[PDB]
Ligand SMILES: *[C@@H]1O[C@H](CO)[C@@H](O)[C@H](O)[C@H]1O[C@H]1C[C@](C)(N)[C@H](O)[C@H](C)O1
Ligand SMILES: *[C@@H]1O[C@H](CO)[C@@H](O)[C@H](O)[C@H]1O[C@H]1C[C@](C)(N)[C@H](O)[C@H](C)O1
Ligand SMILES: *[C@@H]1O[C@H](CO)[C@@H](O)[C@H](O)[C@H]1O[C@H]1C[C@](C)(N)[C@H](O)[C@H](C)O1
């Protein structure tokens with residue numbers, strides 16, 4: 363992971 | 370990054 | 377930073 | 384911590 367979102 | 374720690 | 381993860 | 388070194 364490590365990214366974010368939210369989709 | 371974006372996480373924290375400390376390890 | 378410099379550490380890693382993942383949490 | 385989080386920095387390095389070495390002193
Ligand atoms: C985390 O570090 C290792 C060691 O250098 C790499 O092999 C790996 O690709 C790296 O992970 C990437 C992908 C991730 C977890 N989604 C984050 O983007 C991190 C910062 O980089
Ligand atoms: C990021 O979203 C996940 C779900 O996929 C939550 O479980 C987690 O609480 C959330 O992370 C927080 C803490 C972090 C990783 N240090 C960052 O500040 C993010 C933006 O919010
Ligand atoms: C940083 O030094 C400490 C001692 O104070 C060691 O125990 C540790 O192994 C070392 O950390 C590694 C792993 C890290 C934190 N992801 C970085 O890559 C550093 C440079 O090396």
Ligand SMILES: *[C@@H]1O[C@H](CO)[C@@H](O)[C@H](O)[C@H]1O[C@H]1C[C@](C)(N)[C@H](O)[C@H](C)O1
Pocket residue numbers: 377384385386
């Ligand atoms: C880590 O994040 C918290 C939440 O925002 C701050 O309150 C804290 O000052 C921060 O820690 C600093 C000091 C440290 C651990 N030596 C590193 O430089 C990190 C990135 O920032």
Ligand SMILES: [Cl-]
Pocket residue numbers: 363364
């Ligand atoms: Cl990943």
Ligand SMILES: [Cl-]
Pocket residue numbers: 366367368369
């Ligand atoms: Cl999402």
Ligand SMILES: [Cl-]
Pocket residue numbers: 373374375376379385
């Ligand atoms: Cl750390």
Ligand SMILES: [Cl-]
Pocket residue numbers: 364372380381382383
């Ligand atoms: Cl993480």
Ligand SMILES: [Cl-]
Pocket residue numbers: 384385
């Ligand atoms: Cl500190």
Ligand SMILES: [Cl-]
Pocket residue numbers: 387388389390
């Ligand atoms: Cl040192």
